[PDB]
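Annotators were shown the component list below and the corresponding predicted structure, then asked to write short factual statements about the assembly.
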Amino acid sequence: GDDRELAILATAENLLEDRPLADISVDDLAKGAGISRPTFYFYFPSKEAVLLTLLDRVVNQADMALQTLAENPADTDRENMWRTGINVFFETFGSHKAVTRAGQAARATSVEVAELWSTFMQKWIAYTAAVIDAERDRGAAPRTLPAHELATALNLMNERTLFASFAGEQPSVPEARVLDTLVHIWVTSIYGE
Amino acid sequence: GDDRELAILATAENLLEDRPLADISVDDLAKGAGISRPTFYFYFPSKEAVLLTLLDRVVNQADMALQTLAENPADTDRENMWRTGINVFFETFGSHKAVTRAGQAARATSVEVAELWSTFMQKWIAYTAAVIDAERDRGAAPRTLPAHELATALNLMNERTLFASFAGEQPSVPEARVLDTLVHIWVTSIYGE
Ligand SMILES: Cc1nc(-c2ccc(S(=O)(=O)NCCC(C)C)cc2)cs1
Ligand SMILES: Cc1nc(-c2ccc(S(=O)(=O)NCCC(C)C)cc2)cs1
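Structure shown to annotators:
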């Protein structure tokens, strides 16, 4: 009953490691979760909607993980704070590469995939600006760029660059170097200047 | 003869201001340039190949423009040097928004659009790292991150963020704020930490 949903979801995740959404049919999703095509249609309107449910769970996992960090401050320097935060995304999306890759491709195609991405980006940017602002108020960060514009550009960098790394794109920062790379750019631009 | 090619190219550019490639047919390209469908096929294999020729000319215009700057150093501070360079891309792509937007969408679909992008990105990154390195050698920039990894991340930021701005995406930096925003992040991260 609820198993079947999870099974359809685990099946699409597995099949996306090997091939793109366009190359996975409803039939393959049904088969893999051990159910018929019309039983599939009872849980999902389309394969597309399977991607979106997967993407939704990744995005919320990153989100919840970032909330957790916010409710319990790590006893540490300013560099490590930023690093820990950026690491929520590196680990969460980086443990879900096929879904990341496919969810990103679907922004071109699906207005809901586009709007789910857009909603959380705005949320993660507003939080980065709140923290930059907090940092400015206590006198640790200088008042340079508008905090919101700086956070916008830093979030957008992290999106393209984390995602280029996970996909092994040319060019990209090697995955084992990407965290350090982002964290130097966040910390120099936030504290410098 | 050669007019016809330019006319087909100017027509696709115009039609892309209003609608996506998928919504422009070969027929519309033919009509707009004042020729038949089969006369179209004599200049181009597909609409797709029309996009790619347009994208090729934009990319080379940015490229040539960046070469020019390199052959005649502006008599100026380090911030303005970077600003002038980033401005080549802001102006070039930003004067060609529909082609930018469509060329970017086509990376998902066209291996040649993907490979043309990938080739110039590698070139623009190698040049940014050469200049960062040069800057380190003269003692103006500190040896922090590997120059090539830093340039990778800065180029990728500029791509997503310039392109998000030109498309009016949510979120995005306002277009009238994006240059200043990028330039503070390049200069703090290159000279800081
Ligand atoms: C200590 C703190 N870190 C953050 C924070 C850290 C990283 C990011 S992020 O890496 O820029 N995430 C948004 C884009 C993802 C799709 C890759 C966003 C916010 C906010 S407060
Ligand atoms: C003074 C100099 N500036 C550069 C330089 C400046 C900007 C950029 S760039 O803005 O990062 N361009 C590559 C991506 C485009 C599609 C947006 C790349 C290199 C190299 S040397």
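Statements collected:
1. Chain B has nine helices and no strands.
2. Chain B has two domains: 1-46, 47-193.
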